[PDB]
């Protein structure tokens, strides 16, 4: 009698809450009052008001925030009748073209529902389910109604944090404390020989590029480990110690796998030159 959409909303929609600080959506993932949302919803504030789809309101505490993934965990006081819960799916099962249901609780008295598909996977989910404020921080449901992502506002193309990312961040955020995001601080670019010689053909390019294939430092962000290690705009990173490289993403993964406060040795041309960068926490 209902479509499958009406059904998925009937399964997970009750757990979708309104969040105000003086604004957006969240959803309860545990009968004890654990609530996921976006960090930009809760601001840097720590006191939050949670309104359930049924009208119950809760003084909820911001238990804290990952600015980088844009996730926050709120907790509320599970008094009275039991808090309803959204069942968590898994995002490593998404294919492009799978149905996507984005649910909000902007007002507090009703869900907002929009319908789309998974448009892209990276690790942001992309969907053409209309993703708008108020609806942001609410869940992205699959056809069965399992949370597979967290809507984020930021065309017809909207983004969701894949739910398995939140699953990894949940314990840490819910218990205060900082999710580690190690970085060194360079804007980088993969450099192609055709591209280095191309660049060098132009009398007005800013620097001569040493004709190789590597990682061109485009910018050294101020106050970063990379500035402190003496990296300059124009350096070409070629290998992280040992392993050669030409892929900005492979360097991303070596930095992350390294961890916080680890020296990395870097092979760069400028002249040949290796430096050590002490990873620090992205903020």
């Amino acid at each position: 009698s209902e479509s499958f959409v009406a059904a998925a909303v009937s399964r997970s929609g009750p757990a979708v809450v309104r969040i105000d600080t003086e604004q957006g959506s969240g959803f309860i993932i545990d009968n004890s009052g654990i609530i996921l949302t976006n960090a930009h919803v809760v601001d840097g504030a720590s006191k939050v008001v949670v309104t359930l789809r049924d009208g119950r309101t809760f003084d909820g505490q911001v238990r804290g925030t990952d600015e980088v993934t844009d996730l926050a965990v709120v907790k509320i006081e599970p008094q009275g009748s039991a808090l309803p819960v959204a069942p968590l799916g898994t995002s490593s099962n998404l294919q492009v073209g799978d149905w996507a249901i984005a649910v909000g609780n902007p007002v507090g008295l009703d869900n907002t529902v929009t319908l789309g598909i998974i448009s892209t996977l990276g690790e942001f989910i992309q969907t053409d389910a209309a993703i708008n404020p108020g609806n942001s921080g609410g869940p992205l449901l699959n056809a069965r109604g399992e949370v597979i992502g967290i809507n984020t506002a930021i065309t017809g193309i909207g983004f969701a944090i894949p739910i398995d990312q939140a699953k990894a961040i949940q314990n840490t955020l819910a218990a205060g404390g900082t999710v580690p995001h190690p970085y060194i601080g360079v804007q980088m670019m993969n450099i192609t020989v055709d591209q280095a010689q191309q660049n060098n053909r132009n009398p007005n390019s800013p620097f001569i590029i040493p004709e190789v294939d590597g990682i061109l430092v485009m910018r050294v962000l101020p106050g970063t480990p990379a500035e402190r290690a003496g990296i300059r705009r124009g350096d070409v990173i070629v290998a992280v110690d040992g392993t050669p490289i030409s892929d900005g993403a492979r360097l991303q993964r070596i930095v992350e796998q390294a961890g916080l406060n680890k020296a990395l040795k870097l092979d760069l041309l400028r002249r040949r030159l290796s430096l050590t960068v002490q990873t620090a926490q992205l903020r």
């Binding site: 060194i184 804007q187 980088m188 670019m189 485009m218 900005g248 991303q252 930095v255």
Partner: peptide, 4 residues
């Protein structure tokens, strides 16, 4: 253009 990526940030590491």
């Amino acid at each position: 253009a990526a940030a590491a």
